[PDB]
DNA sequence: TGGAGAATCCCGGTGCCGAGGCCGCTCAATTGGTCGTAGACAGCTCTAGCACCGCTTAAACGCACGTACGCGCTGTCCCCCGCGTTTTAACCGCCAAGGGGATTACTCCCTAGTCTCCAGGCCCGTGTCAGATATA
DNA sequence: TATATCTGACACGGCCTGGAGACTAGGGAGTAATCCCCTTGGCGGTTAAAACGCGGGGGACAGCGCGTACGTGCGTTTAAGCGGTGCTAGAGCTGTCTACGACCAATTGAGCGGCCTCGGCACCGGGATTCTCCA
């Protein structure tokens, strides 16, 4: 046998492809599952998790901290539209809600 | 040197809109959740994680439904949210 | 018995704060208290169902994250 | 051994965010979204897979998922990086 | 002449479009405004007849329920008009 | 080309889905976003239709794209197959 | 051999056993399904059919029609809170709407 | 060719209201019916099945997604129905 | 308060087409037997959830003052409803091309299954840095 | 906003199990061909509905008075909350066995496609009953 490469790297991926496989595999959801299909979804939530991961940090900094909370996360995902509603029926513990004031409130 | 009647409001609004801390006791919460539970089964254990899941939908739930009756409030031309607004708020959301 | 008292008018004044409400009647922790009574009872009913359901008398956190997840209410940060 | 995603978004996080750390409760809360986003395409895929009678779930079954589940620009970004990741797997 | 008062007209067109259950957009127009939205999409698209009645029952019945809730805020407001402030809370209220 | 027949969704049609929904005075601003409301949700429906109708690799969209399309959103729809 | 006695009549069901045994086999939803399964699902499909059916058959007989109509099923439907909440998402095509007119509006 | 509950509902109508028949719209109504409640119940106790490490849709899976699914009454005559019929089954 | 144009309800005749009953058959349900394995059941650990006392202290509760605000009344004017006339595009029928859905043969590449091997992720331990506290 | 301190969560550093390499087999799906439902473009009458216009009436909207009921501050109560200890249900893991469900094969009758028929119901026309507006 010759040097062992994992599939993940052979895609250029930091997420498990042979997880994402296994996972596929056990959850039923067909009789088969092809070669490219762990490639591709481990991809995709790896593009997801960076667009989460970016505007979580940006919202860190713009709070002055280093690490991120799920604050942080909260203003990441509502901030932007495209976040929001893909995650429009999803609670974030300890995430807060976003500082909106309408202007009739205001004196 | 009484201040003007909503500016404490305001200052409320603010504060615990920059805050992610429960807004609810967690003692009262925990009775409450035995006490429905208890017309369901009887003699239930309760982890602390699942009484603080709860109380996190819960208080997320309040949240939305109250940013919901506000929005009713100033289209019925008023500040004060009043039953009305929340029972509107409740029957278009499906409720 | 009686525990719906503990969810007290500043609380519920709190939560209106944090909704953005500037100002409440009087009649609003009535409905607030039903209103989270409902709630509860749903969520606490379906979590009791899948507790049932594996033969335990503990409400773990994830049988509350699957009732949430029944009703379109998703909860992030608790096992989920 | 419960398994996790915890690594992957360290890698990810110090790949684009190099001098930023995280939480324990924003890893729950991150592992809750991977495997949410997960069940979500895969059960898509599935449906997807059932209605046109299929019995294998490909790459274009997961590429129409991310199409209809995704928002437009998140839903672009996403099919070209599983395409541009699918053509480094196959010419490698 | 013989005129009816505002609103008895009204009601009685009210009490008709409940009794009954006739698609009332028109069919044909319904049909060019889904493959004018479709061509936006993929060109040279085909559609069946039925995709089209389904496309027009699941439309009829979201607008009046639509009109239900603008109908319930329009009443909220101490007002028997809609307006269009009224359809913004509603699809504000549900999420969309 | 077809452009601009979103004008054949006529006033009186927002009239009488007014009155099915028990409507009795409509202000004259109604229409235009009525039909932009009707836009929104038929852009919704039939972005989905078409994508399961070009997984298929067909050129007709069948009624059952437009039953998934709107049991995927919410909003299923009975009598035309399931 | 013996004779064959299907599965819905010693159950004591008019609904098919055995069909919704092939589609519960077919439709991956697990690696195995057991006997009672079926025979359960079967039941309360038959359950929830005699329900809808029964008042629609009344809502057609309140409107002296031998025949049940969409119409009908939407009467049924909706008149009944169960039924309401069961099918709150779903529409019923050429059923109509319920005859509501608010009290505000009536002279 | 086509599969479908083109005579078992009309078999309950007929013991249900034995002077009344169906249109063919209201048929396909019903059919549609019973397929998403088919669905709704299945992938209930598949969802259920996963959750606690099982392999096998039993009747107590069935059970508890009726009783999840359907509304109070409506759940505990169903479950009522459902163990008379395990009950019939097994017994006979 | 009572009368008239108009809508509404009720009843009888007519035609139609669509559900509904019946037959051939084929295909999927039924029966019979075998085997492996998922799960039922007992045993045991030790995690964690309930129970309770002290205390000190933040949070809640009651009361009083008062001013912003809800709510009702009035006026106005304007905008939408009601209805007559016109025009215009929907609708139905019949109609042909002709693109494409749907079926069938085949044949081949793709993916399940299996044995082996090893290395990546995971539990545990440690120490060190990022916020919260503290004060002006 | 600026200057010191503390602490507890967090990033880093041996075994085991699951992912990868190589091979085999078989079956699902791609490709080609064909056949016919069914989809669209179009002509033409027609008549129903959309559109336009005019009067008017009722209701959206703005202003104003008033009476009251939440907001806010303060003093007193009370029980959340944290620490600490104790103890016992029961969550969870492991081992063993046994019933039960997948699987394969032969049989057979249940349900579906196809076809013929008759009455339920929409439609038309006339008569009785409100019905809503106005003097």
């Given at each position: 046998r010759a040097k062992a490469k994992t599939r993940s790297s052979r895609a250029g991926l930091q997420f498990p492809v042979g997880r994402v496989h296994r996972l596929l595999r056990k959850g039923n959801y067909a009789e088969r599952v092809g070669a490219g299909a762990p490639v591709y979804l481990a991809a995709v939530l790896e593009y997801l998790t960076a667009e989460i991961l970016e505007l979580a940090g940006n919202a860190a900094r713009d709070n002055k901290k280093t690490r991120i909370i799920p604050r942080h996360l909260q203003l990441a995902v509502r901030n932007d539209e495209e976040l929001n509603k893909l995650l429009g029926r999803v609670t974030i513990a300890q995430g807060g809600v976003l500082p909106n004031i309408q202007s009739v409130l205001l004196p | 040197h009484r201040y003007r009647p909503?500016?404490?409001?305001?200052?409320?609004?603010?504060?615990?809109?920059?805050?992610?801390?429960?807004?609810?006791?967690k003692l009262p919460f925990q009775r409450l959740v035995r006490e429905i539970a208890q017309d369901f089964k009887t003699d239930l254990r309760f982890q602390s994680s699942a009484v603080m899941a709860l109380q996190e939908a819960s208080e997320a739930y309040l949240v939305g439904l109250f940013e919901d009756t506000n929005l009713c409030a100033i289209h019925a031309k008023r500040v004060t949210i009043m039953p009305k607004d929340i029972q509107l708020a409740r029957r278009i959301r499906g409720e | 018995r009686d525990n719906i008292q503990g969810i007290t008018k500043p609380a519920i004044r709190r939560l209106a704060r944090r909704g953005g409400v500037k100002r409440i009647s009087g009649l609003i922790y009535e409905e607030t208290r039903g209103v989270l009574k409902v709630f509860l009872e749903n969520v606490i009913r379906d979590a009791v169902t899948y507790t049932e359901h594996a033969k335990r008398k503990t409400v773990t956190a994830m049988d509350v994250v699957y009732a949430l997840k029944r009703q379109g209410r998703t909860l992030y940060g608790f096992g989920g | 051994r419960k398994e996790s995603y915890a690594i992957y978004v360290?890698?990810?996080?110090?790949?684009?965010?190099?001098?930023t750390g995280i939480s324990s409760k924003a890893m729950s809360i991150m592992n809750?979204?991977?495997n949410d986003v997960f069940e979500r395409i895969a059960g898509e895929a599935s449906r997807l897979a059932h209605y046109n009678k299929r019995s294998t779930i490909t790459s274009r079954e997961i590429q129409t998922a991310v199409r209809l589940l995704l928002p437009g620009e998140?839903?672009?970004?996403?099919?070209?990086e599983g395409t541009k990741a699918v053509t480094k797997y196959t010419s490698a």
């Open positions: - | 909503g500016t404490v409001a305001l200052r409320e609004i603010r504060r615990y809109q920059k805050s992610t801390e429960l807004l609810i006791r | - | 360290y890698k990810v996080l110090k790949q684009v965010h190099p001098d809750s979204f991977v998140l839903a672009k970004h996403a099919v070209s």
